[PDB]
Coordinates of C-alpha atoms in Angstrom, one line a residue:
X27 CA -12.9 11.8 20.1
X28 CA -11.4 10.1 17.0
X29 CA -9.2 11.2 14.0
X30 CA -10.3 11.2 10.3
X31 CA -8.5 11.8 7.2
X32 CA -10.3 13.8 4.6
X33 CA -10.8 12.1 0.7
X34 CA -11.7 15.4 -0.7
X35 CA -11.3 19.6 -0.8
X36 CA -13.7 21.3 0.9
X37 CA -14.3 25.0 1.2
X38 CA -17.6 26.7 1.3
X39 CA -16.7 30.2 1.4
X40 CA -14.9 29.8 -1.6
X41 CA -17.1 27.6 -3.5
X42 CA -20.1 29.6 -2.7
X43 CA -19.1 32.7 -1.2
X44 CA -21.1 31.5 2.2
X45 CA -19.7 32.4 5.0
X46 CA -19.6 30.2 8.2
X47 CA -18.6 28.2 11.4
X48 CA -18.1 25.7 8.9
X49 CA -14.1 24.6 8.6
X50 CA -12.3 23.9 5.5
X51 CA -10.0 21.7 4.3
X52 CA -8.0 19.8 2.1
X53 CA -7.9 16.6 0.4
X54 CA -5.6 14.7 2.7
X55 CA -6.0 16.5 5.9
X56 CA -6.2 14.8 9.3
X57 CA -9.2 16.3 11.4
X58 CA -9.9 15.6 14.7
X59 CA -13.6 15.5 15.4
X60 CA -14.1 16.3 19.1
X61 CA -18.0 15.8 19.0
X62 CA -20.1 13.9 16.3
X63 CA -23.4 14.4 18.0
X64 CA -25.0 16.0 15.0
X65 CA -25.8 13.2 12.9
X66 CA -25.2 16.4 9.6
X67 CA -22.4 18.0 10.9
X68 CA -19.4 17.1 13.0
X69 CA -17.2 19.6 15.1
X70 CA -13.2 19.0 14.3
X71 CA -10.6 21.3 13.8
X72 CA -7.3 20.3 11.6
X73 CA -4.7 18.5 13.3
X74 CA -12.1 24.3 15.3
X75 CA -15.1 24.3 13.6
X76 CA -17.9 22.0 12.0
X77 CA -17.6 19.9 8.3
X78 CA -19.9 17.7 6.9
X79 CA -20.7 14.3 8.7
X80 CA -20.0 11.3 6.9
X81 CA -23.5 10.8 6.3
X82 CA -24.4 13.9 5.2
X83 CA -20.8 13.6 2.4
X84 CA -21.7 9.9 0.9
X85 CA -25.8 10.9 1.0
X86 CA -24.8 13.1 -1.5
X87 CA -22.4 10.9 -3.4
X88 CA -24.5 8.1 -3.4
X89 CA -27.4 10.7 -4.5
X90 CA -25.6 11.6 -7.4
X91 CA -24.9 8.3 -8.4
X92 CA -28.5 7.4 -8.1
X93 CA -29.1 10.1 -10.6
X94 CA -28.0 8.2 -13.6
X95 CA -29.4 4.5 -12.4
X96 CA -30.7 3.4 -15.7
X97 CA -29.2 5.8 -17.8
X98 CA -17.8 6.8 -2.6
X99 CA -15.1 8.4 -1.1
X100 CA -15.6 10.7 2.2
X101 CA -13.3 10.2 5.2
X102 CA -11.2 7.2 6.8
X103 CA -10.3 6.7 10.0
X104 CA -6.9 6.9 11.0
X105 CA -4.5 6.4 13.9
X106 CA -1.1 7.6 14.2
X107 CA 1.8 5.7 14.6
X108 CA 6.0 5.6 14.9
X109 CA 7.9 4.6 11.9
X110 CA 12.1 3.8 12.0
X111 CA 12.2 4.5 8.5
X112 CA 12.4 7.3 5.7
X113 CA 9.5 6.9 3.9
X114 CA 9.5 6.1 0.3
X115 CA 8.3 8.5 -2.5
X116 CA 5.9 7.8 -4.9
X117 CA 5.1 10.9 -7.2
X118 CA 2.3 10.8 -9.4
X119 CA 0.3 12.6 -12.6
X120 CA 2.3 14.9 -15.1
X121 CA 5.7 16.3 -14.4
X122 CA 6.2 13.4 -11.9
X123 CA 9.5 12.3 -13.6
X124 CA 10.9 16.2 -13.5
X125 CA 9.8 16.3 -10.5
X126 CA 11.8 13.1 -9.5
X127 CA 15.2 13.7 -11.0
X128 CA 15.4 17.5 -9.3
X129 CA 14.6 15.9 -6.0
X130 CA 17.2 13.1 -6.1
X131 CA 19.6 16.0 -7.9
X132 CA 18.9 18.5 -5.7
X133 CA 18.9 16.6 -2.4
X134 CA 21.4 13.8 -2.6
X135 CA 22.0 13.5 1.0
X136 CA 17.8 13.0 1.7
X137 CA 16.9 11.1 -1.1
X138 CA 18.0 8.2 -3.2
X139 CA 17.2 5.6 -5.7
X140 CA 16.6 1.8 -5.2
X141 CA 18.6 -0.9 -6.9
X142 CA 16.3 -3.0 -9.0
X143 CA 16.4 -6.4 -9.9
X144 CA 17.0 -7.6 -13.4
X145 CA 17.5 -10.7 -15.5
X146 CA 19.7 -9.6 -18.4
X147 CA 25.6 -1.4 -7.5
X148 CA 23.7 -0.7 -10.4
X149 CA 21.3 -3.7 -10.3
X150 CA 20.6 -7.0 -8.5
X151 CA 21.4 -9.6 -11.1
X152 CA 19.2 -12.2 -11.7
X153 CA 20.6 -15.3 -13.4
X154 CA 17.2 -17.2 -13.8
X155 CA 14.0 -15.6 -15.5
X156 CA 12.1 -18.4 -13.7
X157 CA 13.4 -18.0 -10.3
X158 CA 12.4 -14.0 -11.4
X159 CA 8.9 -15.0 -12.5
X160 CA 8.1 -17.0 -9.3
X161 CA 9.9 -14.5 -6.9
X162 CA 6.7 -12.3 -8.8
X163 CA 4.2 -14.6 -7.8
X164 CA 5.9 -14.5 -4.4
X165 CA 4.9 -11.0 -4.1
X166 CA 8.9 -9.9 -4.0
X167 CA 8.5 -7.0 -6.0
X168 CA 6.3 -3.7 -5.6
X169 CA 6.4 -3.6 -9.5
X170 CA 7.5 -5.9 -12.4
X171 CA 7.8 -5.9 -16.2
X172 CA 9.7 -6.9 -19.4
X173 CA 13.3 -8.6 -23.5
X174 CA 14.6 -8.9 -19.9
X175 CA 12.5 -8.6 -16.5
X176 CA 12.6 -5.5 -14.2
X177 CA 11.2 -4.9 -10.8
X178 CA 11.7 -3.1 -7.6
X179 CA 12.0 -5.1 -4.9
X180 CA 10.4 -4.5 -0.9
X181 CA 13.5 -5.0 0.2
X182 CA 15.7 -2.9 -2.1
X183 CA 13.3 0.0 -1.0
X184 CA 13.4 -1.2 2.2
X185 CA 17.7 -0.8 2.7
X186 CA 17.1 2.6 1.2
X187 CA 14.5 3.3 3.9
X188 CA 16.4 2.1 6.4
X189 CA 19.7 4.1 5.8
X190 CA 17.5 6.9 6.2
X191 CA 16.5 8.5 3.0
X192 CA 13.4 8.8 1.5
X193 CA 13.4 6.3 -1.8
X194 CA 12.6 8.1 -5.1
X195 CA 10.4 5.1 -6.8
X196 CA 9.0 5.1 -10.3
X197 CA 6.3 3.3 -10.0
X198 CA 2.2 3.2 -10.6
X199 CA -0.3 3.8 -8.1
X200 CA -0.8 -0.1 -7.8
X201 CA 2.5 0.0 -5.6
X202 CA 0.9 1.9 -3.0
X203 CA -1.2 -0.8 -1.8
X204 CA 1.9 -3.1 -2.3
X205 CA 3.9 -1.3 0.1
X206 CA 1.6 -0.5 2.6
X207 CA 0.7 -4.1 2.9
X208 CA 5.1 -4.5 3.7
X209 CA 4.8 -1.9 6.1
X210 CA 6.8 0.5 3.8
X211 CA 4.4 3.6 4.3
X212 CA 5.0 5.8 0.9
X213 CA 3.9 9.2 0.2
X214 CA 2.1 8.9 -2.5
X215 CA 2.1 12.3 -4.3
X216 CA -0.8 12.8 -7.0
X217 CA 0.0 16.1 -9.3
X218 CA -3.4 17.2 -10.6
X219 CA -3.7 19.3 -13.9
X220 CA -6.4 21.3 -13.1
X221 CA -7.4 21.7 -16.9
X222 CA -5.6 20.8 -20.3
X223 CA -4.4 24.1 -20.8
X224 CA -2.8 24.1 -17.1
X225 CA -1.0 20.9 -18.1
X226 CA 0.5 23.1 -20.6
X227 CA 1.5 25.9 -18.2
X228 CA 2.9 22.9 -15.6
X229 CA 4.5 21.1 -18.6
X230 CA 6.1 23.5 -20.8
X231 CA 8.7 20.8 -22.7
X232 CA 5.4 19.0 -23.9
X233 CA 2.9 19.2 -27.6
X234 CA -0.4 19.9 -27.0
X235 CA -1.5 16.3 -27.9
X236 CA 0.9 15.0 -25.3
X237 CA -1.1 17.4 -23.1
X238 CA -4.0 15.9 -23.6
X239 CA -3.2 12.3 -23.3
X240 CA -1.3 13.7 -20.1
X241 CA -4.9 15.0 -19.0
X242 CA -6.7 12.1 -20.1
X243 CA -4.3 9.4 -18.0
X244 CA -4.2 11.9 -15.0
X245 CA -8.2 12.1 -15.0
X246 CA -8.4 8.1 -15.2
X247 CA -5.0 8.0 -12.4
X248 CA -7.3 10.5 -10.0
X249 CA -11.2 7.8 -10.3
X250 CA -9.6 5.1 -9.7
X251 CA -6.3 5.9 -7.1
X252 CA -7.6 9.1 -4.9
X253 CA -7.9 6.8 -1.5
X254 CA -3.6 5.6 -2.0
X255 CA -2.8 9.0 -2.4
X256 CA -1.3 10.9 0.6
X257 CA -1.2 14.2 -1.2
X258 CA -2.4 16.4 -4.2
X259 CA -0.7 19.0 -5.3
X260 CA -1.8 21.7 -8.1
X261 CA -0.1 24.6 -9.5
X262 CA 0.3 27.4 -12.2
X263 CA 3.9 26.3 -13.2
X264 CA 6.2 23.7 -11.8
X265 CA 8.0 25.8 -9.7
X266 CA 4.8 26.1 -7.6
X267 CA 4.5 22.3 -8.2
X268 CA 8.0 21.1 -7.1
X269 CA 7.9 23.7 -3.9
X270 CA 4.7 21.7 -2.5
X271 CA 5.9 18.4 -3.5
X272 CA 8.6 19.6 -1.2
X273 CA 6.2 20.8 1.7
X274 CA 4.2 17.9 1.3
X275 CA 7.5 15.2 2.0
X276 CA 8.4 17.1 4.7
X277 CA 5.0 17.5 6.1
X278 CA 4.7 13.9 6.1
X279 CA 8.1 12.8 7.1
X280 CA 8.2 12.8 10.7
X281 CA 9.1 9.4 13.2
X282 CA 4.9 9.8 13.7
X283 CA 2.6 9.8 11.0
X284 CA -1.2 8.8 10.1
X285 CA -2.6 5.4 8.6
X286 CA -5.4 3.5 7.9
X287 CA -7.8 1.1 10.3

């Protein structure tokens, strides 16, 4: 058959109290679908039962869509293969910098921080801004800014990688796509408030405004980013939060893993 990674949480009997042959699963999960002879549904079971086709899933995307004409994520296909390095870590929505520091805290030995470039052991000193400003355009850095320029470079990840620890990066969601296209894999890690009141029970060193603008970017982060993220994790507290983050590194953080095309 052929492998598949699911874009979105499915589960019937819990949505609609329906119960079924029907399998259920979560954003992120790699299926394998052993016969997709029904043009609606598809038999798979998670790397045994039937989930929607991809038809059947975008139809109804693109149907709701339609529904405000004048007024599409499914599945991907993926393959698996070897990688000779720790993968990077990219951890995303609120909490994502407590959830950082405890990790690299906490686990020393697995994971570590990069050593950035910058033009004003600690960092990679740059003595031109222009030689920094074209190395940018040369698509040396996963992520750049500035009265000095900063950036992490592919290959300062890359010797982090390689000595074999996973590389605690703070960066956006646009880095994903940079990294992947270096062959740097990350597990990108999306923390999902599930309301504004739960970013308040997740984030309890935060005022309720901060909560919302919290809310608001992690809303905006999840439409535009969902298909570079390798995980979501949710939770009542960030205790629940940081022991999934956990789960999820380790689940993905084997010499094999799954990737696009």
């Amino acid at each position: 058959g052929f492998y598949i990674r699911a874009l979105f949480d499915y589960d019937k009997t819990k949505d609609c109290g329906f119960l079924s042959q029907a399998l259920s699963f979560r954003f992120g999960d790699v299926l394998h679908v052993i016969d997709a002879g029904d043009e609606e549904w598809w038999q798979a079971r998670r790397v045994i039962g039937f989930i929607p086709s991809k038809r059947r899933v975008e139809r109804r995307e693109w149907s709701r869509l339609k529904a405000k004409d004048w007024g599409v994520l499914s599945y991907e296909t993926v393959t698996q293969m070897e990688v000779h390095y720790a993968r990077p870590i990219i951890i995303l929505g609120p909490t994502k910098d407590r959830a950082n520091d405890d990790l690299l805290s906490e686990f020393p030995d697995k994971f570590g921080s990069c050593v950035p470039h910058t033009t004003r052991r600690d960092y990679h000193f740059v003595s031109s801004r222009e030689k920094m400003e074209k190395d940018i355009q040369a698509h040396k850095f996963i992520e750049a800014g500035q009265s000095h320029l900063y950036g992490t470079s592919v290959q300062s990840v890359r010797e982090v990688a390689e000595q074999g620890k996973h590389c605690i990066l703070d960066v956006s969601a646009n880095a994903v796509r940079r990294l992947q296209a270096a062959h740097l894999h990350p597990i990108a890690i999306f923390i999902r408030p599930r309301s504004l009141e739960n970013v308040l029970e997740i984030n309890k060193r935060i005022t309720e405004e901060q909560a919302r603008k919290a809310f608001d970017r992690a809303t905006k982060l999840e439409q535009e980013f969902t298909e570079c993220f390798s995980a979501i994790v949710e939770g009542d507290s960030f205790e629940e939060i940081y022991h999934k983050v956990k789960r999820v590194i380790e689940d993905l953080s084997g010499p094999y893993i799954w990737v696009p095309a």
